[PDB]
Design a protein around this ligand. Structure first.
Ligand SMILES: CC(C)N1CCN(CCNC2CCN(c3cccc(-c4cc5cc(F)ccc5[nH]4)c3)CC2)CC1
Ligand SMILES: CC(C)N1CCN(CCNC2CCN(c3cccc(-c4cc5cc(F)ccc5[nH]4)c3)CC2)CC1
Ligand SMILES: Nc1ncnc2c1ncn2[C@@H]1O[C@H](COP(=O)(O)OP(=O)(O)O)[C@@H](O)[C@H]1O
Ligand SMILES: Nc1ncnc2c1ncn2[C@@H]1O[C@H](COP(=O)(O)OP(=O)(O)O)[C@@H](O)[C@H]1O
Ligand SMILES: Nc1ncnc2c1ncn2[C@@H]1O[C@H](COP(=O)(O)OP(=O)(O)O)[C@@H](O)[C@H]1O
Lengths: 723, 474
């Protein structure tokens, strides 16, 4: 209805004053791009930015960053009146002053250390009366523009003189500082954070609406994850980006206070935050204040918890206070904290993943002035088990190396070291590797829940089985209208059975990767640890973990591992049942229908599998993953060799048919036997590092076939019965 | 408030609870409602601390101290009745108890109606479909399922505008209409909750859902219905009816449906104890949980308490050569103890079902226990036609496929083996429907392709074992 057409959004692509705007209509505003444009703020403020195109931007909204947003005093999800006018007029020698407390970063020349690279070729239009951010030399600072000769705005080129001041002045307190953390300062690309967005949008960005309409906004939210995974970021950066007042109930701060004034300090916490609305109260270490499990040593702690429960229920539906609370494990906190109206929603922050850990490594080194060679993606792989705090420490520890090395050899210093004397330091791969060596992670023990990186290409052969998984996994969620028609419920389970090494685990990961579902692998040593420790009550949390990670594929490796531990020829006198596989049955039947969770079992020995596993409503679909043939062997060879570079003379079609009965893993042995020899050559040749036809011949001298031919019959026999 | 009196300091915590009953004296009639009674009186004689000893004692005095002037009723809520102190149940304290329990499928519809009656729903969603998906949700989950589906549509439509004043217009919010996509999204984010809790529900399966088994159907009604409907007759001969029935037969012949259908007919609660649940008490060597299964049954009365797979523990040890031990073991022993200890037949009927009657502890079968052995055999093609018809009454079927022939061709199948075929063919129809748009109906050739995989679970030598066990029983 003649609407303007502007919405404000986070911008993931990394730019100082650049904007994306939707292709599905480029003709309404009609900007060729690179054309100076208006932006309408609040209060009487405006901004000027440059526009680019994105296939993956929405027709709905507009990618722009945190420096433009703070200038306008716009926020996310907000709308600013916008108008194109193409024109722009050049200007002179733009003038610059330090802003706020920040300063002392630069000693002497401060436009050598800062300006030259950023106004270079950019044509960054720069306004009177705005703040912007220059990064470099392990620090960030902002230069206000108080005086510009041409107005309202000026495009800049390096034909102009350079004027300098460099003396600080207090910035207005009403302003929102750019160091206060916000969405971009949170890394990991978990996308889970997007879930907290949907919860806190309306309640604390639109307070007056909930007095108009009956609905129940959530009062509490639990973040949980191991320490250092960014739980305090999320609260700080939701409260900062929405304008709500952030409060902080230090888990042990209220504990450090004496009996009877400990409650006084927590209760006034919610009373203050009442008066500020909307507000997030963020209790961290909730398991400090409310860790009672009905077990409860002591006295005082009974009363701290009760007061908190009253406070969390006592929220009086005047004002908006959202109470976010973080803890390491959700079993840790008192069970009465989850009742309706207390902490209703929970979020698992969890360990980041490989291509999640890249972003954290980008956010902690963006001021560091890196070397070219290291791209951070290589270190991102080595880093599994690290959490965002480990990674911020990996970077600070690699940044403190280079200071130790270069620089202080000089010892030259005054009350503040010059900004430029520290420019020549550039963090290097040797620094990072040294840093990786001293990390000490941490979270290695925690289970892994990740979208797996293996794809369909990584699987040679198995084309039909690949289709059949997509049938079982994808059609019920994509076409529920069809399954409802016949009243049929899809299967939740699949049991892979076959000889060892034929690609059952990759086949499970590849379908989770395709759906970009989380993958949780429970391995035979993990089912054996519950069985030797005769604690199968931990099966529930594996499942609870799966439910929280949904949509996921929950994969059980080696699901006969316990039947083997007893036997598997004559076994125990007992039948096929036992304590752990029994709980898996209990927890499959107890699942709340099929809700984003798909189960895949895999076994070498279907003989010894408890036949109750195979019943209707459990893992009904038995799929037989057999040994490859030489068509699928050519594909397996090609699929393994797609990484390590290969010299063209070696022939990959012949190696196949010559190895008559190998499993897929037996071909990995050969490929790994030959790549070993190439490294064996490369390192011995410099004391020409490529892989040769004769290595796969020397590798072949050791070629071994794991799966004997009598048992192939056992598989076929088990399979030939199954019809 | 259970924790409100707790939040107060020592010595003024009692002052606050005692004045609670003194005020409510002056107002009559009045309900005092203590919630989280297990906060104020959770002591089991275990009792960490000091203060809590005295909070509980004051409450006991208060609950006994009701002076028969005025009327004060004290209602108190708690999560499990074992949680609260045992002295709270003595005569004159909390004498009556009520189990509210999880709602059931056609119960959950009404909650979904009461929380969305202001919402201005779309036509398509009737709420009965979501009511089915919702098992494990409780009324609070469902009020949250609706508020979460109502907050979706506000997020979507509407605020795109941003038009607002001190109060948004009543009509500007009229155009928002909650949709199935909103609800499904909501179902996706519910997080229930109560999934673990045992299920006690009138089952939805009827007599029609059971092909065949006409005589056995009569005999259940005899055992279940006549003693309660005609107690004047059983008293005449001084005869006490049987409390139990043991179904025995091959796997998949409809023993579980037959148990649910008689509970459905009586509109009795149905409690299914499944073999993995008897195995969990046995591996965890906690059979003291058999009592609460029964206590739960007593509270749910009239119910049919059904034990699936009642030989599952005998198999876990053996079932050919077994343990050196005899047929007894810890869990089946408590079931014997708790059957004999039942307060007569009071709305609770027990049904055991087993595939292996060989390995059943013969003490199960004694007088006063599960005396009536009924043999549920494999169907014949009359009952196979009925089983086929009974399964296919839901999923729509195109008339050309012939259901009389498929029967007699499958010579030895159990009832569950025919479900495999019907499910094998309905799978292929969905296989067609989704691949045809990238005409969704079921065909005579699908039951032919389904039949290519047709498998017979129950071997013919063991049918003899059943008949043999049966042919002995006379
Ligand atoms: C065209 C494209 C750009 N659009 C966006 C991408 N989507 C991909 C659709 N992927 C879906 C959603 C995730 N999947 C998934 C993940 C994890 C578990 C399950 C799952 C659980 C489950 C339980 C059952 F009982 C039965 C089936 C089940 N599937 C599904 C299914 C495929 C395409 C459009
Ligand atoms: C005509 C119709 C409209 N009227 C109303 C509906 N009633 C139906 C009568 N249904 C009765 C009551 C519920 N039943 C029931 C439910 C659960 C358990 C038992 C039961 C326990 C038990 C224990 C024993 F030791 C022996 C027998 C037992 N039966 C009975 C029996 C049939 C008709 C009139
Ligand atoms: N996922 C992440 N992305 C970016 N930075 C992170 C992340 N996780 C941790 N950090 C950094 O390390 C610190 C994590 O500590 P904290 O916020 O206390 O996490 P938690 O609340 O889980 O203990 C933060 O100061 C933040 O700068
Ligand atoms: N079909 C296949 N395609 C590609 N690689 C395979 C295949 N089968 C086996 N492999 C290789 O052999 C190894 C063992 O396979 P795995 O997935 O562990 O099978 P399983 O779980 O059945 O033992 C894998 O690391 C993989 O690289
Ligand atoms: N007589 C029957 N009538 C209708 N369906 C049957 C019959 N027997 C078996 N079935 C089908 O086979 C499945 C298995 O039956 P079930 O009740 O589990 O028998 P059991 O408990 O003896 O294994 C049921 O879901 C049912 O749909």
């Amino acid at each position: 209805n003649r609407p303007n057409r502007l919405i404000v959004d986070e911008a993931i692509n990394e730019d100082n004053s650049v904007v994306s705007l939707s292709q599905p209509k480029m003709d309404e505003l009609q900007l060729f791009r690179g054309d100076t444009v208006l932006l309408k703020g609040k209060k009487r403020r405006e901004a000027v930015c440059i526009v680019l195109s994105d296939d993956t931007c929405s027709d709905e909204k507009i990618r722009m960053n945190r420096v433009v947003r703070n200038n306008l005093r716009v926020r996310l999800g907000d709308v600013i009146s916008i108008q194109p006018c193409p024109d722009v007029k050049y200007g002179k020698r733009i003038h610059v002053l330090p802003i706020d407390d920040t300063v002392e970063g630069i000693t002497g020349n401060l436009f050598e250390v800062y300006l030259k690279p950023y106004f270079l070729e950019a044509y960054r239009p720069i306004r009177k009366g705005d703040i912007f951010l220059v990064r470099g030399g392990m620090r960030a600072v902002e230069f206000k523009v108080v005086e510009t000769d041409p107005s309202p705005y000026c495009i800049v080129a390096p034909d102009t003189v350079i004027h300098c001041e460099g003396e600080p002045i207090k910035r207005e307190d009403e302003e929102e500082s750019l160091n206060e953390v916000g969405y971009d300062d949170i890394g990991g690309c978990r996308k889970q954070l997007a879930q907290i967005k949907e919860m806190v949008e309306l309640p604390l960005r639109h307070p007056a609406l909930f007095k108009a309409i009956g609905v129940k906004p959530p009062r509490g939210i639990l973040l949980y994850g191991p320490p250092g995974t960014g739980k305090t970021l999320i609260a700080r950066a939701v409260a900062n980006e929405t304008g709500a007042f952030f409060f902080l109930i230090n888990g042990p701060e209220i504990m450090s206070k004496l009996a009877g004034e400990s409650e006084s300090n927590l209760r006034k916490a919610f009373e203050e935050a009442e008066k500020n609305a909307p507000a997030i109260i963020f209790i961290d270490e909730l398991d400090a204040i409310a860790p009672k499990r009905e077990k409860t040593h002591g006295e005082v702690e009974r009363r701290i918890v009760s007061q908190l429960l009253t406070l969390m229920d006592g929220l009086k539906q005047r004002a908006h206070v959202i109470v976010m609370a973080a803890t390491n494990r959700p079993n840790s906190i008192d069970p009465a904290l989850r009742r309706f109206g207390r902490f209703d929603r929970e979020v698992d922050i969890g360990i980041p993943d490989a291509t999640g850990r890249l972003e954290i490594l980008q956010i902690h080194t963006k001021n560091m002035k890196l070397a070219d060679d290291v791209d951070l993606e290589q270190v991102a792989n080595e880093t599994h088990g690290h959490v965002g705090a480990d990674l911020a420490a990996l970077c600070s520890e690699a940044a403190l190396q280079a200071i130790r090395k270069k620089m202080d050899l000089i010892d030259l210093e005054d009350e503040t070291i010059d900004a430029e004397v520290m420019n020549s330091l550039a963090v290097t791969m040797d620094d990072f590797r040294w840093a990786l060596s001293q990390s000490n992670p941490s979270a290695l023990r925690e289970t892994v829940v990740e979208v797996p990186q293996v794809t369909w290409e990584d699987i040679g052969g198995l084309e039909d089985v690949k289709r059949e998984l997509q049938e079982l996994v994808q059609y019920p969620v994509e076409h529920p209208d069809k399954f409802l028609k016949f009243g049929m419920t899809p299967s939740k389970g699949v049991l892979f059975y076959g000889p060892p090494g034929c690609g059952k685990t990759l086949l499970a990961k590849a379908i989770a990767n395709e759906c970009q579902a989380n993958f949780i692998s429970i391995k035979g040593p993990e089912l054996l640890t519950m069985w030797f420790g005769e604690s199968e009550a931990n099966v529930r949390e594996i499942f609870d973990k799966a439910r929280q990670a949904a949509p996921c594929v929950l994969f059980f490796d080696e699901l006969d591992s316990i039947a083997k531990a007893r036997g598997g020829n004559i076994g125990d006198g007992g039948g096929a049942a036992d304590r752990v596989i029994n709980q898996i049955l209990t927890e499959m039947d107890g699942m709340s229908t099929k809700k984003n969770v798909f189960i895949i079992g895999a076994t070498n020995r279907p003989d010894i599998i408890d036949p109750a596993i195979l019943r209707p409503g459990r893992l009904d679909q038995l799929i037989y993953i057999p040994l490859p043939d030489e068509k699928s062997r050519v594909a397996i060879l090609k699929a393994n060799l797609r990484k390590s570079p290969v010299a063209k003379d070696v022939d990959l079609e012949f190696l196949a048919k010559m190895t008559n009965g190998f499993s897929g893993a037996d071909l990995t042995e050969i490929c790994q036997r030959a790549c070993k020899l190439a490294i064996r050559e490369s390192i011995e040749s410099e004391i020409v590092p490529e892989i040769r036809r004769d290595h796969f011949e020397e590798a072949m001298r050791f070629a071994r076939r794991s799966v004997s031919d009598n048992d192939i019959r056992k598989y076929e026999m088990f399979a030939q019965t199954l019809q």
